[PDB]
Design a protein around this ligand. Structure first.
Ligand code: CLA
Ligand code: CLA
Ligand code: CLA
Ligand code: CLA
Ligand code: CLA
Ligand code: CLA
Ligand code: CLA
Ligand SMILES: CCCCCCCCCCCCCCCC(=O)OC[C@H](CO[C@@H]1O[C@H](CS(=O)(=O)O)[C@@H](O)[C@H](O)[C@H]1O)OC(=O)CCCCCCCCCCCCCCC
Ligand SMILES: CCCCCCCCCCCCCCCC(=O)OC[C@H](COP(=O)(O)OC[C@@H](O)CO)OC(=O)CCCCCCCCCCCCCCC
Ligand SMILES: CC1=CCCC(C)(C)[C@H]1/C=C/C(C)=C/C=C/C(C)=C/C=C/C=C(C)/C=C/C=C(C)/C=C/C1=C(C)CCCC1(C)C
Ligand SMILES: CC1=C(C/C=C(\C)CCC[C@H](C)CCC[C@H](C)CCCC(C)C)C(=O)c2ccccc2C1=O
Ligand code: SF4
Lengths: 137, 33, 741, 80, 150, 99, 160
């Protein structure tokens, strides 16, 4: 779950932040714990100071959230960053560390979506899947 | 009322009224749920 | 402590690495598996920041590269002086500067190219030159080919000294990073020593060599009959004839009785009536005053003795309520990044080149350069192009700094951070102003074209119709015309006769006359504003969005120069600061082309011409600018179609080379569009077919052929576009002006 | 949304998963490759179409393919 | 000091600046008809159209095709009326397309509110253009831009 | 008065008065050049204002000293106004930042 | 004769010669005798006259424009206009291609073919340059021995 009381990384403000589409459609959030007060780069532009402890940050796009997470993981050594998506109804959902472990390493429980049982050369032709419901797979 | 008046009667229509009405109706149609 | 520290024998001079292309780079030292390796070698040859992480190594490489560049420039100068001494008509031009066309290049008679050895004059036939070297030498007081031979020898010796210095300071005594990071000492020495002593030495040369020699030349004495500069130096009586204050000596100087030198140090202003250039007695005073100013300015910074400033203190002290920390961190940024320094210096050098072009035409500084219309046009346009290129390079290296050497930790709530934190406001407002200027500058031309085509000539924006008068420019011109005696009391004439005054004529030909601004001038100036603003928009937008944007939050990781980030997000083509530079170079070409066309037409229609015995001047085009330059049809017909006759009818003449280059530049410009309108997949597939053809004959290169990278295709397209366009204008301008002057 | 697919050629290098600016690809278990892992695309609705996964793929013909389909706010990467 | 986060929200796409959040700026914006409190969407439209149709008559009057004629002012008024009708049509189509028929109680962001706003804007614009026409036709200083005093 | 969301600003008109006097009193320094007449910058500006008020509707013609005097005087006045507000608000009696 | 007139007896060709010589003489009239410009213009006149005379005697045909025209159809009376020149080309070009292909194979069978292609082995390159003088028989020998044309099943091709 997400706690909306976590302080924020004392940013000085920017014109690259979220806009009305965040209040209407979707607003992403990222929470991470920092061992000290470092200076990091906002994905929107500018410098910010992360706090000693938990830090919550709001962004407009999952790519922005994940770019910030990658910066924390590589530049710094913070890997406890969690990403959430918030709708206007208050339907905060959990996305990154989806199963609690990063996707780059296999974990028991996942189900393969979009996997095909041949090489790309075995795809059918559009002439063969024309006027039919067959799939080029 | 002779045919010589038809250009002055029609060119403003075809060139300002027809395009305006077409644009308005097409706007309403394209942005409509 | 500002001190000298070097490493001795850091790099051993050996040809071992000459046979290992790509040695400087880790990815390239492996070898050419494909042809992309060949292009990468050249694209990354001088990117020292990507070869090593050592700022000391980068700084040493840069120092030695500068020495090599200086040696190349000295070789260039020695070549020009030697050609003036051996393959020129300089003595004939000295005898009769207003009748013989300057020439210092001769071609060999091989395939009929000897036609290019036209009848320049003075019993000499060669290639007319438009660089102004003859006038430079005349101002310098050169009156022989022997002196030019000695000039060439000095240039060659300095080129050798510079190449030796580069080798020595890379391989024998390489200074350390502490030596390089002396901004206070370097600025002190440059300002005082380099600039101040350079202009002081030039003032001395003008006072002892140029002034009397040119005085006699203007008096009509023969170059052979004029005495030698050392005769002037050692015969204070001979000099005291021409300038009677040398009988007084240096006592007035040291007693502050400086008025005694008014004979050769004066503030006359205007133009020399005989030569049509600036008074060399004014230039001497100019350079002496500049020497004083620079030597004083070079005593501002702290080096070893407590007295002076620290730029860190100044910058950190300059902050306000709208800027947070202000200029904090900038001193460190500028003493740790060569790219930031290169960007600042390139911007300033290009702006300086543009300023130099404007001034050097309105205030002809050399004897007999103003009536040499080919020289004036060529120099103006040349320096305009150099300025534009330098500005675009400044944008490029600002982007490179932002991607490579920008660190948010060191830049928090300073000016750089605050700019990045409101870049959207800047770019949106600049977008709006660019659109507004485009409309209210080009739609005016379109309105005029439509009104002239409809027969509503009274509805146009013209002097004979609705008027757009540049009242502010005319007001400034009036101020400058009336300044002599009133706001510059001790100046005899106006700084430039372009602001207003009497026509200056040399050899029955206008050297400089007032330039009148009307509706067409208002229009063209606002178009200049539009083009400059759009170029700035492109370059600044790229620089500010180099690191990140709403579209690509992680762009600094992709780098300063990357092709794209894929067909996703709708398409992310040309989203790098490099591509911003690419588009901004297109737009700089647009801007400078319009500027040089404006100069050419305005000067041929309202300044340049021949003055009759009636004192009336008939111009080359004859006033067609006022009533034709208000319509795009006017520009197409009365400027391009009308003035292209000289270059398209140059076959069989000495300008046939200009005609051929006209056509070839058209060819290259069109050839660029193949690279600009196209993509890499098509050419890679065509290469696949061609490689099949080669394989069918049991052979194919071990270096697999590949189509140019996306970035390289864009670069090739831009390079060919610029070469073709600038070459077309080059041939057009030179043919036209050498035919009608 | 864009349609991202994985094929038997996967070798489990995981570079496709690590190259994705979003989180669309994840490693799951498999027996067809030595690494015992195969890429899968559960969150295909977050795909933007950059094809960074395609770039970070070492198999002759890519084991991961992105077929650009219908465009949405997330696919177009519209922060507005 | 003077530039700060917007509404104390560091991550919203805005900055609090003197032009954007000063006392004069806030007072001016909050007192303009588009934002003043208590006005109906109709009254907002009335004031705005009155203000706009006034300035429209001048550009047409003094730079239109029939500006050097004796019918310049009438032509100008007529052309203003045409532009006002076009813009009213734009407002109406924007209202029908953007706002669905849910009732938010005439907040200017509703179908009914925008219909009232566009009706008021049309009425006020035509009225202001007519008022400017009357004033120009009757006062010489406006027909000459002050070149009667010369 | 708030210069921003919550930043207050005094907006003292005595700063304006002091800056005006600081630029104008030096402007009294006379010059015999044609532009000034015999008088100083401020006095010349006053004289031109009166002279061209006598001929009200007609503007001072291009080339009249009025435009140059106006531009120079107002350039200096605005410079002094900026410097005076800087001094009163940053170096003044209630500033917080050490400038 | 084919459809035109011999250039040795054409008033148009003579007029062109006259015009060129008169242009050169007008340019010469403004230069002192014996000066480098006079000598250069005189040499230009001599070269023009020699060129026109040689073109006349060559048997070139000239049209109404007064310029030589080429009959590149195969006629042996005009072989020197396209065919013999083109045979010389084909010889040189086959030489270049044959030696280049030989060097490509030589570098292929080396420790570092790419190094051999960027930094050349100029002794072997000069060897091949020398070999290139009998390229026709050598190339046909390669073809007939089967070392030239590769099989369809040994050349990479894209999928259909
Ligand atoms: C092809 C169709 C077309 C037609 C018939 C016209 C007709 C006209 N144009 Mg032109 N115009 C057109 C296309 C056309 N335009 C295009 C494509 C452009 C863009 C480049 C322009 C740009 C343009 C400009 C910039 C100007 C004109 C003007 C004029 C007027 C001619 C000069 C005059 O003395 O009238 C002027 C005298 C008058 C008394 C004007 C009365 C006009 C009445 C009020 C029209 C009724 C409008 C109607 C109620 C709107 C219905 C909207 C609905 C479709 C949604 C006339 C009304 C001039 C003008 O004065 O326009 C106002 C003018 O300045 N036009
Ligand atoms: C760096 C600038 C520069 C440039 C662009 C040129 C350009 C030229 N020089 Mg050179 N020249 C230079 C420097 C330069 N020079 C210097 C520094 C010297 C002094 C040693 C000379 C001394 C020199 C002589 C003595 C001659 C030239 C000549 C030439 C022309 C023909 C060269 C040629 O075809 O060589 C091709 C050679 C190859 C090996 C290829 C050409 C216009 C020739 C000329 O003008 O003849 C009419 C000529 O005779 N130059
Ligand atoms: C670096 C520049 C330079 C150099 C090397 C010299 C060198 C000389 N000057 Mg000096 N001179 C210079 C700049 C220089 N001057 C300048 C800028 C001025 C203007 C103030 C003068 C004004 C000046 C005068 C008026 C005289 C000299 C003279 C001399 C000679 C005796 C000292 C000597 C040749 C004396 C002399 O013999 O002149 C020929 C002399 O009378 N100079
Ligand atoms: C003081 C001048 C200066 C200096 C020291 C540098 C230095 C640098 N620039 Mg450059 N740059 C400059 C001016 C300068 N620039 C200007 C004026 C521009 C604007 C056009 C640029 C735009 C620019 C860009 C956009 C980039 C650089 C880059 C670089 C770096 C590597 C360049 C390289 O490897 O070139 C090696 C040399 C070449 C590749 C040769 C290029 C010459 C081309 C092909 C045209 C030559 C035409 C020539 C005039 C002849 C035409 C006639 C025809 C008939 C043959 C290096 C730090 C690159 C960088 O840092 O990337 C990370 C980079 O991307 N610069
Ligand atoms: C043009 C007029 C002018 C100028 C040049 C200055 C200059 C100065 N004032 Mg300011 N000041 C002015 C008008 C001016 N003042 C007025 C009208 C008032 C009354 C409202 C004040 C009230 C005031 C106070 C209360 C204080 C200052 C201070 C200062 C000094 C440092 C701060 C500063 O503004 O740096 C000015 C910038 C430079 C010196 C750099 C020169 C740059 C040029 C333009 C290039 C400096 C000498 C402070 C100080 O140090 O006192 C001595 C201080 O305490 N001023
Ligand atoms: C487009 C069609 C075309 C083609 C492909 C050719 C081809 C040829 N014409 Mg041409 N010709 C054409 C149209 C064409 N012609 C037309 C339309 C005309 C009339 C305007 C002529 C008029 C014409 C004449 C008058 C002659 C030719 C000849 C030739 C041949 C010259 C080489 C030769 O004889 O090699 C023979 C050599 C060898 C087979 C081997 C030589 C071996 C060693 C290396 C020597 C060649 C086969 C000449 C010829 O003799 O053709 C038979 C010739 O005399 N043609
Ligand atoms: C001064 C005159 C001149 C000039 C400057 C050129 C220049 C050129 N010619 Mg040449 N050409 C000329 C006269 C000239 N030609 C004449 C008079 C003829 C008529 C015989 C030809 C016939 C000719 C042909 C048939 C070809 C060229 C090609 C070329 C281009 C590439 C040559 C090459 O890469 O060689 C280096 C050599 C190689 C790369 C080896 C392979 C190619 C050569 C030409 C094969 C030669 C032997 C082969 C068995 C001939 C079979 C020909 C048959 C299929 C018709 C080059 C721009 C080539 C071209 O445009 O390709 C796109 C080309 O194929 N030319
Ligand atoms: C005007 C002057 C022109 C007239 C002069 C005529 C002399 C031409 C000489 C040509 C020559 O020496 O070819 C030398 C080549 C060597 O080729 C080489 O032959 C090699 C094998 S071997 O040499 O045949 O043993 C083979 O591997 C290699 O690829 C091949 O290039 O000889 C042959 O291969 C076949 C020669 C053709 C015999 C018929 C000619 C009848 C006349
Ligand atoms: C130069 C013209 C300056 C405009 C006033 C600006 C002015 O002088 O401000 C200067 C003001 C003073 O800032 P501080 O006193 O905080 O900083 C002093 C500095 O020395 C320390 O960084 O800085 C800003 O507020 C920058 C805002 C730029 C304002 C952006 C709008 C202007 C964009 C450029 C377009 C201008 C067209 C004008 C016509
Ligand atoms: C920003 C700035 C800087 C420098 C100083 C400056 C003052 C220029 C300032 C800018 C000021 C500006 C932009 C001022 C513009 C003012 C404008 C456009 C004012 C418009 C006023 C409109 C008026 C009366 C309209 C009157 C309309 C009337 C009765 C209509 C009446 C009628 C109506 C409404 C409908 C029925 C018919 C009837 C009865 C005739
Ligand atoms: C024509 C073309 C090609 C094909 C062109 C290639 C591969 C260039 C190779 C040319 C040869 C190898 C250069 C040498 C020959 C030249 C005649 C010499 C001039 C070049 C040197 C001065 C560097 C691309 O690969 C390409 C890629 C991306 C965008 C546009 C394009 C594009 O337009
Ligand atoms: S990269 Fe290609 S192969 Fe390696 S894991 Fe991702 S998909 Fe499987």
């Amino acid at each position: 779950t997400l706690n909306l009381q976590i302080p924020s990384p004392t940013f000085e403000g920017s014109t690259g932040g979220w806009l009305r589409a965040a209040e209407v459609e979707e607003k992403y959030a990222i929470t991470w714990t920092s061992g000290k007060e470092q200076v990091f780069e906002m994905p929107t532009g500018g410098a910010a100071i992360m706090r000693k402890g938990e830090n919550l940050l709001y962004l407009a796009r999952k790519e922005q959230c994940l770019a910030l997470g990658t910066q924390l993981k590589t530049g710094f050594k913070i890997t406890d960053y969690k990403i959430y998506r918030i709708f206007p109804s208050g339907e905060v959902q959990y996305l990154h560390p989806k199963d609690g472990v990063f996707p780059e390493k296999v974990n028991a429980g996942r189900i393969g979506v979009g996997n095909v049982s041949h090489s790309i050369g075995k795809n059918l032709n559009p002439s063969q899947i024309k006027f039919t419901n067959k799939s080029f797979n | 009322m002779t045919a010589a008046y038809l250009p002055s009667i029609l060119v403003p229509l075809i060139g300002l009224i027809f395009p305006g009405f077409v644009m308005g109706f097409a706007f309403i149609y394209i942005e409509q749920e | 402590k500002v001190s000298i520290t070097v490493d001795k024998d850091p790099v051993a001079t050996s040809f071992e690495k000459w046979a290992q292309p790509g040695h400087f780079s880790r990815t390239l030292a492996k070898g050419p598996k494909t042809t992309t390796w060949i292009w990468n070698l050249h694209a990354d040859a001088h990117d020292f920041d990507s070869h090593t992480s050592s700022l000391e190594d980068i700084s040493r490489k840069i120092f030695s590269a500068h020495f090599g560049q200086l040696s190349i420039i000295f070789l260039w100068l020695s070549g020009m002086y030697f050609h003036g001494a051996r393959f020129s008509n300089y003595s004939a031009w000295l005898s009769n500067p207003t009748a013989v066309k300057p020439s210092a290049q001769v071609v060999w008679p091989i395939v009929g190219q000897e036609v290019l050895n036209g009848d320049v004059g003075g019993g000499f036939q060669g290639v007319q030159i438009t660089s102004g070297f003859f006038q430079i030498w005349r101002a310098s007081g050169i009156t022989s080919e022997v002196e030019l031979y000695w000039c060439a020898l000095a240039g060659l010796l300095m080129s050798g000294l510079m190449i030796f210095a580069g080798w020595f300071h890379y391989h024998k005594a390489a200074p350390k990073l502490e030596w390089f990071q002396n901004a206070e000492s370097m600025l002190n020495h440059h300002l005082s020593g380099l600039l101040g002593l350079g202009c002081l030495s030039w003032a001395g040369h003008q006072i002892h060599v140029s002034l009397p020699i040119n005085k006699l030349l203007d008096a009509g004495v023969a170059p052979q009959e004029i005495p030698l500069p050392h005769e002037f130096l050692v015969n204070r009586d001979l000099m005291a004839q021409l300038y009677p204050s040398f009988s007084k000596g240096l006592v007035p100087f040291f007693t502050l009785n400086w008025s005694e030198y008014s004979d050769f140090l004066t503030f006359k202003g205007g133009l020399n009536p005989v030569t049509g250039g600036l008074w060399l007695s004014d230039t001497a005073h100019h350079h002496l005053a500049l020497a004083v100013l620079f030597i004083v300015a070079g005593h501002m910074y702290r080096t070893n003795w407590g007295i002076g400033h620290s730029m860190k203190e100044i910058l950190e002290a300059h902050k306000g309520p709208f800027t947070g920390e202000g200029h904090k961190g900038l001193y460190e940024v500028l003493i740790t990044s060569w790219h930031a320094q290169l960007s600042i210096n390139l911007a300033m050098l290009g702006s300086l080149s543009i300023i130099i072009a404007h001034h050097m035409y309105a205030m002809p500084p050399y004897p007999y350069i103003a009536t040499d219309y080919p020289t004036q046009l060529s120099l103006f346009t040349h320096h305009m192009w150099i300025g534009g290129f330098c500005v675009c390079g400044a944008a490029a290296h600002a982007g490179i700094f932002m991607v490579r050497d920008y660190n948010p930790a060191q830049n928090y709530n300073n000016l750089l951070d605050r700019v990045i934190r409101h870049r959207d406001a800047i770019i949106s407002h600049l977008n709006w102003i660019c659109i507004f200027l485009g409309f209210h500058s080009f739609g005016l031309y379109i309105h005029n074209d439509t009104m002239r085509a409809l027969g509503r000539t009274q509805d146009m924006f013209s002097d004979t119709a609705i008027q757009l008068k540049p009242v502010f420019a005319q007001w400034v011109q009036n101020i400058h015309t009336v300044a002599p005696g009133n706001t510059t009391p001790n100046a005899l004439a106006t700084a430039s006769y372009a602001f207003g005054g009497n026509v200056v004529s040399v050899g029955n030909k206008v050297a400089m006359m007032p330039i009148s601004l009307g509706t067409a001038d208002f229009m063209v100036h606002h178009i200049h504003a539009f083009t400059i603003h759009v170029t700035v928009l492109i370059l600044l937008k790229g620089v500010l969005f180099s690191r990140n944007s709403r579209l690509i939050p992680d762009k600094a990781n992709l780098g300063f120069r990357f092709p794209c980030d894929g067909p996703g997000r709708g398409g992310t083509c040309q989203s790098s600061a490099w591509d911003s530079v690419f588009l901004g170079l297109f737009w700089m070409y647009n801007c400078i082309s319009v500027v040089i066309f404006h100069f050419s037409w305005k000067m041929q229609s309202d300044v340049w011409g021949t003055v009759q015995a009636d004192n009336t001047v008939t111009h080359i085009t004859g006033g067609n600018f006022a009533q034709s330059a208000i319509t795009i049809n006017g520009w197409l017909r009365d400027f391009l179609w009308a003035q292209a006759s000289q270059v398209i009818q140059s076959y069989g003449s000495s300008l046939s080379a200009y005609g051929l280059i006209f056509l070839g530049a058209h060819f290259i410009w069109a050839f660029s569009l193949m690279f600009l309108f196209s993509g890499r997949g098509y050419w890679q597939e065509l290469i696949e077919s061609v490689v099949w053809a080669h394989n069918k004959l049991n052979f194919a290169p071990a270096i697999q052929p590949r189509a140019l990278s996306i970035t390289q295709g864009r670069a090739v397209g831009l390079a060919h576009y610029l070469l073709g366009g600038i070459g077309t204008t080059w041939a057009f301008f030179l043919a036209r002006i050498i035919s009608v002057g | 949304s864009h349609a991202v697919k994985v094929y038997d050629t996967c070798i489990g290098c995981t570079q496709c998963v690590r190259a994705c600016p979003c989180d669309v690809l994840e490693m799951v278990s498999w027996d067809g490759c030595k690494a015992g892992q195969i890429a899968s695309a559960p969150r295909t609705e977050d795909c933007i179409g950059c094809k960074r996964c395609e770039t970070a793929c070492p198999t002759d013909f890519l084991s991961v393919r992105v077929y650009l389909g219908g465009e949405t706010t997330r696919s177009m990467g519209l922060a507005y | 000091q003077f530039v700060k986060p917007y509404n104390d929200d560091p991550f919203v796409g805005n900055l609090a600046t003197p032009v954007s959040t000063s006392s004069f700026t806030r007072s001016f914006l909050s007192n303009l008809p588009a934002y003043r409190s208590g006005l109906s969407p109709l009254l907002r439209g009335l004031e705005i159209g009155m203000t706009h149709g006034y300035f429209l008559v001048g550009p047409f009057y003094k730079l239109g095709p029939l500006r050097n004629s004796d019918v310049a002012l009438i032509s100008g008024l007529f052309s203003s009326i045409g532009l006002i009708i076009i813009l009213a049509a734009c407002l109406a189509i924007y209202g029908v397309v953007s706002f669905n028929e849910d009732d938010n109680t005439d907040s200017l962001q509703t179908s009914r509110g925008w219909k009232q706003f566009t009706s008021g804007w049309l009425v006020g614009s035509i009225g202001g253009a007519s008022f400017a026409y009357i004033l120009i036709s009757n006062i010489v200083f406006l027909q000459t831009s002050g070149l009667n005093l010369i | 008065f708030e210069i921003s969301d919550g930043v207050e600003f005094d907006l003292n008109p005595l700063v304006l008065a002091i800056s005006f006097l600081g630029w104008s009193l030096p402007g009294l320094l006379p010059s015999n050049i044609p532009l000034y007449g015999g008088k100083g910058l401020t006095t010349a500006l006053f004289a031109e204002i009166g002279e061209h008020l006598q001929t009200f509707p007609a503007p001072p013609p291009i080339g009249d000293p009025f435009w140059v005097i106006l531009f120079i005087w107002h350039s200096g006045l605005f410079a002094t106004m900026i410097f005076g507000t800087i001094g009163y608000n940053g170096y003044g009696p209630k500033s917080t930042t050490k400038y | 004769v084919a459809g035109l007139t011999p250039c040795k007896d054409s008033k148009d060709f003579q007029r062109r010669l006259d015009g060129s010589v008169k242009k050169l003489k007008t340019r010469l009239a403004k230069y002192e005798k014996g000066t480098p410009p006079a000598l250069a213009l005189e040499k230009q006149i001599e070269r023009t006259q020699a060129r026109f005379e040689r073109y006349g005697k060559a048997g070139l045909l000239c049209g109404t424009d007064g310029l030589p025209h080429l009959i590149t159809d195969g006629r042996w009376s005009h072989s020197g206009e396209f065919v013999i020149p083109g045979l010389f080309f084909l010889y040189i070009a086959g030489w270049i291609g044959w030696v280049g292909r030989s060097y490509v194979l030589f570098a292929r069978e080396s420790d570092k073919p790419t190094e051999k292609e960027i930094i050349l082995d100029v002794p072997a390159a000069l060897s091949f340059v020398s070999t290139g003088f009998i390229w026709p028989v050598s190339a046909f020998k390669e073809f007939t021995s089967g070392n030239l044309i590769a099989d369809e099943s040994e050349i990479t091709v894209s999928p259909r």
